[PDB]
Design a protein around this ligand. Structure first.
Ligand code: 8QI
Ligand code: 8QI
Ligand code: 8QI
Ligand code: 8QI
Lengths: 199, 195, 196, 198
């Protein structure tokens, strides 16, 4: 719930062609276009980590990961946060948990909920109400990707990595029928790939 | 077979030989395994896993909560092998709170440290009862301790002396998370960060 | 292909979207290519290089000076491909000064960090060709769309950028901005701040 | 100039080959891995801050000696540039290459970067040639110092690893331009010496 919408990727002109970057060859016909390369994600994630310690560094941080199979972004975000802490000459305690949808550990602490993708946003909103119930000092939501979808409730994430168009993306932290885990770029899935690896 | 064996006669490296956080200067006695050495070993471990379990679909279970870090890096190296194999390979990723889906599947249990070995032996008995095709355990650290039952993981990163270590994936009252290397905690550190 | 094309519509990113050293906050105007984007593109360039001339032994020549980071990273990806090729592939690595008989009959890769007008490379190619090499191709990280270009185009291009003076990654300004890992447009303030 | 760096003892040196990831085409060409790639990186990171605390106050001249190697110089520079990001001032730095315009060294902090020091004759030859251009401060960094009686008694200001007297390859150390894709420092085998002979 802040002004920064993050790195915007418009419907006019999105992403780069597949030939310009290194894609696993078994995914050659399963993707349409690359929206966000792995390294671009890392750079943005590094800035997000500095945004988090800027607004939440005041109290003991509880980093809360959602278990959607996507551990990748949560692990990367935390790595950058730890990188900041090791050069702060104060030893900074931090606890990390996981939620699948005892939380008494959240009382009076800065809670950071980390999400990979936000589409409808009611999965996210549902989690705020449960965490706020345990009376934390503050709750912030980090999201790597926010899709511009008509299924928008109106809820706005605090820390956003990228704002992407309404396409079904896979890669990096997002999978499809447990496929595309070895793909480190965020790319749009094709009709071929959507049918080939269908459940 | 027992992994990289860190003997008892001299225990890793001096603190000033590597870059440790300044606020952990007095809280450590010695560095056993530098971060880079862990990563290079884990890359080989990932190759060993694909060797004995790459036959069928792999369900990788992370034991919560001793440390997520080793699990994250182990799977990163596994995916690296998968994307260069000219073959679309699916993989299940799950976490254990300490589940009947595990029936007839190739299950990989990932632990960051094994001390006595009783936690893992207990976890194994619970998993086998759901009749999995194969269950193997990967452990980053196995300690040489007289308090051990006799359990040995299928995959071992390092065999270390009987000393309380922190860093990389092992914390102490939610401290030392920002420490990359595996180091022995000092008596100062134990008392400074007690609960 | 001309590589990744950065148009002049409204390119780059706001400085607030990425991590930038605080002592460079006022000295930069906009970030064109983040460090990670350079690396992902460079990895692909390494693949392209190890296909048009990466058959056997190559001689990789880095132009001095102007940069070194791009040459180091490009070779790191090349060496990463070689160690998965199931074949021991030797490689010559050396640097060239622009004011050498080894190049005779060799497969030469000239690595450059940026190409503006292109006369430096045209001049460089004409001299190398006189030593009669088996083949000489040029890889460049950046190629600027400038009205000043003679018309030279490299065999391999990383990014095509607007006619703006950029610093970072492998490009400096009076030996400053070396610690800046993103490619960014230097501001008027910084340009005057770090003058020679 | 008396911290010998990470000492690798000689009764049992390094690690077995099967414990780490080694390129398949080098499987028979090596005997023993001394220093894994990641261990080099961690040590190099520490070296980078040793350098910056002594010399790195202001403007330094990073001088690389060309052996066909460059990897260590590039990695050491990367860690140094990583430190200067968290400094609260902009640090200028010049990087150059020399094989044995040197008026540019006068009155500046000169850092000579070496990958391997064996007898040490190369370094003291180079030192005597640099110190006569009157630099404000000239010091030597070396990734590897071999422990050999053939040494002329020269010791570098900054040392990464002190290794036994064996012929090592990998990471910034080639053998007839081979082993460049090997990221670990390993001992070359007899099969390797003949397989990649000139
Ligand atoms: N790979 C991929 N997955 C996506 C995409 N968009 C949504 N998802 C999954 C969704 C939860 O999954 C619903 P299900 O399949 O489990 O029923 O995530 C958003 C929810 O958290 P929201 O905020 O409530 O909308 C996408 O573009 N690519
Ligand atoms: N950081 C750190 N932690 C250690 C160390 N040795 C043991 N632990 C914790 C122990 C579980 O701790 C129970 P708790 O008291 O924390 O609740 O893990 C081993 C069991 O899984 P085991 O195999 O059954 O013995 C150590 O050297 N360093
Ligand atoms: N950092 C930075 N440097 C730039 C830029 N554009 C040009 N240069 C330098 C120029 C050579 O330097 C001339 P000097 O400084 O020695 O006088 O490189 C182009 C020649 O190779 P070209 O192809 O012949 O035009 C730029 O945008 N950023
Ligand atoms: N790969 C590899 N190379 C080594 C090793 N030990 C020495 N070298 C080369 C030597 C110069 O090479 C002489 P050449 O054969 O090229 O003529 O470097 C040391 C001189 O700088 P020093 O200090 O004066 O003795 C080693 O263990 N492995």
């Amino acid at each position: 719930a802040t002004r920064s919408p993050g790195v915007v990727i418009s419907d006019d002109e999105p992403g780069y062609d597949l030939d310009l970057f290194a894609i696993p060859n078994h995914y050659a016909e399963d993707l349409e276009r690359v929206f966000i390369p792995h390294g671009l994600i890392m750079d943005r994630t590094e800035r997000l980590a500095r945004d988090v310690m800027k607004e939440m560094g005041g109290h003991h941080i509880v980093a809360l990961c959602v278990l959607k199979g996507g551990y990748k972004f949560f692990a990367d975000l935390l790595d950058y946060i730890k990188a900041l802490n090791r050069n702060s000459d104060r030893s900074i305690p931090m606890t990390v948990d996981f939620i699948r949808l005892d939380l008494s550990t959240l009382t009076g602490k800065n809670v950071l909920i980390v999400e990979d993708i936000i589409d409808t946003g009611k999965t996210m909103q549902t989690l705020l109400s449960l965490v706020r119930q345990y009376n934390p000092k503050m709750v912030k939501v980090a999201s790597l990707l926010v899709k511009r979808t008509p299924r928008s409730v109106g809820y706005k994430p605090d820390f956003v990595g990228f704002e992407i168009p309404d396409k079904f993306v896979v890669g990096y932290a997002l999978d499809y029928n447990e496929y595309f885990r070895d793909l480190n770029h965020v790319a749009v899935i094709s009709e071929t790939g959507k049918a080939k690896y269908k459940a």
